[PDB]
Design a protein around this ligand. Sequence first.
Ligand code: ATP
Ligand code: ADP
Ligand code: ZN
Ligand code: ZN
Lengths: 474, 561
Amino acid sequence: RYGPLRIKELAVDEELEKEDGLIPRQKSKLCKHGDRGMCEYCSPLPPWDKEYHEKNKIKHISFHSYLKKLNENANKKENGSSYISPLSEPDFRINKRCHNGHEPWPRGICSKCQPSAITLQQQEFRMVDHVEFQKSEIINEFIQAWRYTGMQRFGYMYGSYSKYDNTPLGIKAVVEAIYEPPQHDEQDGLTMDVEQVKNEMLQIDRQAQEMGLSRIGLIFTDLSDAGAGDGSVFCKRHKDSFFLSSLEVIMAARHQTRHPNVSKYSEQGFFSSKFVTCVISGNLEGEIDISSYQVSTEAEALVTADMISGSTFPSMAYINDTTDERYVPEIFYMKSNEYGITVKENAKPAFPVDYLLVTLTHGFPNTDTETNSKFVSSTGFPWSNRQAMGQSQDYQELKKYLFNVASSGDFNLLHEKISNFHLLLYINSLQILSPDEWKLLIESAVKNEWEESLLKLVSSAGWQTLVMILQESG
Amino acid sequence: GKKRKDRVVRNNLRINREDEENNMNEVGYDDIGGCRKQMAQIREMVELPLRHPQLFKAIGIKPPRGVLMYGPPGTGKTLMARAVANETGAFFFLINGPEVMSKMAGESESNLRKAFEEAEKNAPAIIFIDEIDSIAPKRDKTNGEVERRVVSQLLTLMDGMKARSNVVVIAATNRPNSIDPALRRFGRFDREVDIGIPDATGRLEVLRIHTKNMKLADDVDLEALAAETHGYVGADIASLCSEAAMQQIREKMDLIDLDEDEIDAEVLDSLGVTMDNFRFALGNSNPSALRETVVESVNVTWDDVGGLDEIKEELKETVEYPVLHPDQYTKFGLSPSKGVLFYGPPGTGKTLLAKAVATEVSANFISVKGPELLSMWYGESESNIRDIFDKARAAAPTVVFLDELDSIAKDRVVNQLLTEMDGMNAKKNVFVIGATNRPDQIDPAILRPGRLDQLIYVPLPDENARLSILNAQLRKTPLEPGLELTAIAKATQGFSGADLLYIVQRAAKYAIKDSIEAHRQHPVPYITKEHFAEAMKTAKRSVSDAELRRYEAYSQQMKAS
Ligand SMILES: Nc1ncnc2c1ncn2[C@@H]1O[C@H](COP(=O)(O)OP(=O)(O)OP(=O)(O)O)[C@@H](O)[C@H]1O
Ligand SMILES: Nc1ncnc2c1ncn2[C@@H]1O[C@H](COP(=O)(O)OP(=O)(O)O)[C@@H](O)[C@H]1O
Ligand SMILES: [Zn+2]
Ligand SMILES: [Zn+2]
């Protein structure tokens, strides 16, 4: 394209790419030179400096810094090339159309369209660094579901991305609300029809985008209470055993491949979706601390061409066999032995999945800093698909929840009782309101400076009809 | 003020304290001596591009980017580069060869790229790649893959920066041959600066600079030390000063106690260096610059060569007129002579004559003794014929004096020398002199046109020449008043200058023996005629009669042609 590709991505990526991240350093005691001029120790530290990370207890290099490293390593300016694109996602599907003279793969294959051996190796750049929950109620209610019922749960989480200063050119995914799809949960697992779930999630995603949110991951609970009198749970997931079994890694890789991250520095324009997966199991103690993970890019491109399946051993993923329409070359997973030497071990039968993960760091915002929460909610109207419990969205619930405040006033109280995710979704499903009426509803509920917008909403006819039907209904 | 600085004010302008005390950098132009020409060249190449870029833009040219700088170790190459960088008052990024070549795989290239990029960012910039021969050595010696990778990275960076940039790269290497040849083309280290051993004035200046803080005693003759010190580079002079100080300490150790932790300041007040300490340091000095070919500086005039007036005027016509009067040659379109070969009995003063010729045109002098040529023939020497001629080109004008040329010219070395001579630029004033004693044995291929075609015979000194040589050799030796040497000169018919020097040596040896005997018995400030008489009685010609006859016959035969 005679230069950088032209394409539009999120604002976070743009602002990150604007910066440089150089970490300044002062005159070391080892320098031998005047004030001006810098030898080798006073030079600015590149943002991708591996020593700085491992010295600061940071395990991966904040993908944007990885992009800076790749751009610096090559692409000399004004000469030397015509901008060979630096990033390219792995692709293991056999080229069905090569034709050096041979026929398609099923009955012929040369040495140019033969997928070469795949060398698994733990990734070094984590696209999304810090997953952050605006309010602990978001996950507290989610766990409360299991508390009441005892069965496991699973839900997508909506939110948006932003900068993260604590890591060089790092990103954080701030989750605002959680949405629960219709699943047939059980004791040891859960089941949910994929087709219906995606059909529902399509319109839920459309509405959320109308609200400004976005789908940025899936969170599920692997919790089993112990026999202790108080609340204690066994820690089945730690260094000794698996972190995420093969099935969860497969599902995470599928989801990541289905939410590509549009970028400007690749041949296809996308790379390594920003889609964090979180799991709740309980730390070594009786707590219910959460975690986070994200499957590496190879596993993302390793499961598009099948080639992986779950295994009875939790921590190992079974490998499939060759057949027409699916060519699976030898897989070598490269570790480092205790003597600091890299060792390649062929793993056709099964290999650990810890080479197909990168870890994140969960957290919560400081409880005495600026609160930019979109929703002051998560304690009120029943959530969507909690039919199994006594929870059930319906007219009488709305009457009991937002009739006394609505009929009198308390615009502060009305606003705080109107900025709830699930309530907004339900009243939207009611269809009692017109398009622009619902637009002003959301702009009043999910925004600051909301006085005139709420006044306009109440002054509208649609809200009057809604409150009238609420009054009519018991 | 000075050194880009802007009693307390004087100290601040240079007109915990340990950090600066041990970091006494900012070695300005006043901390270098004896390299005025090289320093001027470096200043022209560096300051002007950075200080006043508008000149080259007005003319419309691109100033040189790379500035190679090579010479014997210990001549202050790194010090000169640091002084230039500090005086120019411009950003500059150090790179120490061994340091870059002493890091894990895949990081040396990272350091090089970071250096070049950062120097680019803060233009104007001066990147000083020290010991470049340790990161880009000759191809054959270093077949390691990492070395090739580093060399390629350096080449890529060097080529890729020459674009509207105020970055000047300065490199230091022992010899011009060690560096990979790929780093000596256009758009790279094209302009090169050679540094040679200083002359007497240079050594005096170096001693002045180094012996400024030492508490010298009033009885110092630094001029005498400078005259005696020959072949001493600056590092050796610093070592000499250190050794003198240590000798003073050892002498004063009697009045001091080692076990005592404190040392009395009153004793320290008496730490005065003496001439004896400097002479002892000379005794313990180990100069090594001359072990390899180096561009020297000679200061012999037409007074240390007696007689041979016709040869002197012939040499003048052959050498001085081209260099001194190129306009006439251009007018007549005559290419100046490119060499000359001296033949004759050994010890007739060929080397002194060549040194005088070199001094006349005020040009540098390079000596290539026969053992060095044989060592290169066996291929066990650091230098090389190509290296010699490259240094001669760099330090032009120069006179390259091949000595004992018969040994090699009884093959590989002769052919290589012929190729180098043919490839030399005719216009450039660089001359090659040859010394030999077997003109017949010399390969005829050398004496072809465009080569050492001029043949000059050096006869044995005559009576007047012998007298002049005797007078010259005895300039530094005391003599009895009213002592005549005409008798010795006439009695020494057929002797060569070396024989006359041997006679003087023997006479002075007898005189010193007598002085030693007299002192031991306990008077001999002068040399009496008896010493010379006995020495002559114990002296003989070093030239065989048959060789003289054949030399004269050869000269007559050549004249007939
Ligand atoms: N004019 C001078 N010429 C040479 N040396 C000088 C001069 N003035 C001072 N010196 C001293 O001589 C020594 C020169 O050492 P220096 O490290 O500069 O030499 P070098 O061989 O060029 O170095 P490098 O190891 O970088 O090749 C230092 O002690 C310097 O202080
Ligand atoms: N005009 C002269 N003729 C001969 N010898 C001289 C003359 N002037 C000085 N000498 C002495 O002759 C010696 C010549 O030494 P050298 O040049 O090594 O040998 P050669 O003369 O064979 O080249 C010097 O030590 C020098 O003192
Ligand atoms: Zn430094
Ligand atoms: Zn093919």
